[model samples]
Target: MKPKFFYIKSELNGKVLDIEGQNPAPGSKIITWDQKKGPTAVNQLWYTDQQGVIRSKLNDFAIDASHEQIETQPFDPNNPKRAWIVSGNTIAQLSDRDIVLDIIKSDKEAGAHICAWKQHGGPNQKFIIESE
Candidate 1:
């Protein structure tokens, strides 16, 4: 299927897991948080690591992962195969191959957060486009 792009919905109690320091050193498991937006800011850029894991730094608001330096990959549909957004409500999920900026919501609030199992090809992985 063709890849798509979408917006990550920040919901209450949503967790943006495993965000370590400036760079999440290899083998360092990050933590999750109840998603909250402090201010209107630019959505940082992120990509998958060798393990397909997504990690970001708090102050930098940047994605720190392996294979994250490729510029061809765009987090937006306009640009694909380079970057993507791990999105969702309550429970978050990653976008499909080639898809970007897709925002998906969990089946229910307070439930086991989706995308924790690395099942990138499921309904929980599907997301809605919020912008170009």
Candidate 2:
């Protein structure tokens, strides 16, 4: 728990969330398609706003889910869709109609879509973050 950035993972599957690339930039960085390796990659680095919104260290932009894929955009205070609510260890999105970030299909593998879905009390809805 000492890295400048932290690893965002699903509590149910322990899948680490990351942007789908080596060097990430705004609009170029894809969100949550690959749950690969550990927090070694800079693209895997993440930090959260006190409001609970999470942003990528690579692009310094916030992460939001729209349609099917997640997007890395700057946080707009006027747009609450860019906001996430952190309760306990759970990171839930307040956008796109109150959905929680979930491991697509709950499959334990890399390259799975980490899209927004209706929040469920199941293990898949839970998430854990680690620093190191």
Candidate 3:
């Protein structure tokens, strides 16, 4: 079986950005840049993940706060400088340097809110990998 990896959460202005990448070692930096740009990318920085996986990259699945919302609410008292992963229908909090969060909740029913939080735990956080 292939191993799985995840990004550690960081807070900027109260918003969390999960930095994901391949073979990311400790002290490695991660950056966010425009996909359209060519040559060298900008805004890259180092990030660390305890568990390492192959062919795995951090994807922008969803966020609880929008850019504007983040600007306003810069920090979550419950989860500061952290991000969560959405597996199936559950949202798992990714903090405390733990891959799994104690708090898993159901997602909203509507497609618009499909990524939004609903019940505590469900299938949202569960996912299966199919090798192509």
Candidate 4:
């Protein structure tokens, strides 16, 4: 009955999370572009379910962690790895618990990869919402 903003991926401080498809379909660069808005249309939307899995509303997949890389898979109620815990502007990626979601290499370029890491409160780990 309300809109909730929780998790976001990675990008420059002024960039918006863009997508690669208008089909609004799902598969996987699940790419990041200069265009704002889309898990695509790849603007990944994260919504939490009762099981604590933050799933993409457009595709029914959750942000899956693999070697500091991000992937998507079905949300598993039985797996804590599929869960995410949001804290203010930071999101902790989970494989067992809290491993702060971080920007790969801390690159502030228009396009970057989102990954998980230990907390440092660096610019890469902090998420900010931008408006047009």
Model 4 per-residue lDDT tens digits across residues 1-132? 433433354534544443334333433433344544433422544556665555554545665564346655556667565567665666676564457666666766666666667787688777753322
What's the lDDT for candidate 2? 0.63
lDDT of 3 at 63: 26
**Model 2, span 1-132: residue lDDT tens:** 232557677776666667655554554435343444654466766776555666666645776664467666667777665676555666667754356777767766656666667767777667777763
**lDDT (0 to 1) per candidate:** 0.31, 0.63, 0.26, 0.54
Which lDDT tens digits does candidate 3 get at residues 1-132?
Answer: 333433222111111122223232322222222222222211111112343111123221222232212111212346432354444322343442233321122232211112223343344433232221
At residue 120, give the lDDT of candidate 3.
39
**TM-score computed on alpha carbons, candidate 3:** 0.24
Look at candidate 3 and tell me the lDDT of residue 129.
25
lDDT of candidate 1 over 1-132, digit per residue (tens): 222222333333333332333242332322333333443211222333443433232221223222322211112323323233454422222334333321225443432322233444554444332431
Q: Give candidate 1's total backbone clashes.
A: 13
* Most accurate candidate by TM-score: 2
* Candidate with maximal lDDT: 2
Model 1 ranges off by over 4 Å: 1-18, 22-32, 39-82, 85-120, 127-132
State model 4's lDDT.
0.54
Residue 24 displacement (Å), model 1: 12
Which residue pairs show collisions in model 4? Answer: 19-42, 20-42, 38-43, 39-42, 39-43, 40-43
